């Protein structure tokens, strides 16, 4: 007991690299947590992004929201994409996780989750939001990220609608 409660319940998903399954089937629900200490409990006992296989993902989403386009919470939504050192990547991922659970965003209801893609060429870190046409919320979330993650002008920050993504990229907001 005596653990510090979080505002929301979060679920960690692990996209496995298994071509014998469809993409949706690859999504493995690891566990959920709703206190700060339980988050660190999970974090201290799962491998950082820089240590897991290529083609796999880590996704942290609010309870009852799946990390996929099909989920009702994401249908009308989009993502702030950050295009990308092992230490640099792990720490950036952690800082995003701490922004989420710490509720650093004023438009909290618009937050769905965050996804980190681990690929051979490069690695993406994305923050998914509920309504892509809600520019006020999207921009506010965008500014919090750039400020919190201390993103320099070196790297870019672009918002992409899920509908434009699945049709194969158009970025409607940039910061």
């Amino acid at each position: 007991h005596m653990k510090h409660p979080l505002m929301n319940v979060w679920t960690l998903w692990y996209l496995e690299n298994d071509r014998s399954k469809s993409w949706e089937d690859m999504q493995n629900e690891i566990t959920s947590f709703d206190t700060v200490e339980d988050f660190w409990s999970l974090y201290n006992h799962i491998k950082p992004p820089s240590e897991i296989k290529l083609g796999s993902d880590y996704s942290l989403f609010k309870k009852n929201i799946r990390p996929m386009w099909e989920d009702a919470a994401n249908k009308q939504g989009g993502r702030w994409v950050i295009t990308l050192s092992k230490t640099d990547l792990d720490n950036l991922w952690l800082d995003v996780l701490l922004c989420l659970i710490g509720e650093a965003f004023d438009h909290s209801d618009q937050i769905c989750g965050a996804v980190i893609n681990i690929r051979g060429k490069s690695n993406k870190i994305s923050i998914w939001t509920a309504d892509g046409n809600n520019e006020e919320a999207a921009l506010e979330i965008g500014h919090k990220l750039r400020d919190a993650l201390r993103l320099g002008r070196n790297n870019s920050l672009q918002y992409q609608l899920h509908k434009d993504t699945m049709v194969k990229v158009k970025s409607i907001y940039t910061l």
Partner: protein, 58 residues
């Protein structure tokens, strides 16, 4: 709003409860063994150091 800044989140990382195994550890071992680490609680050599992580930022 129930919120926490990075300072406090990092501080709570050095609690004992932040090192003990997750509740679903058994099921995690059964469904996703490839991503698990630090299985020996006696060894905290690779435990996350929040105080240093906070100090490293300046």
């Amino acid at each position: 709003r129930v919120s926490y800044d990075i300072e406090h989140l990092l501080y709570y990382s050095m609690s004992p409860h932040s090192w003990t195994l997750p509740t679903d550890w058994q099921k995690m071992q059964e469904t996703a063994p490839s991503i698990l680490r630090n299985k020996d609680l006696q060894d905290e050599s690779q435990r996350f150091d929040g105080d240093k992580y906070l100090a490293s930022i300046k």
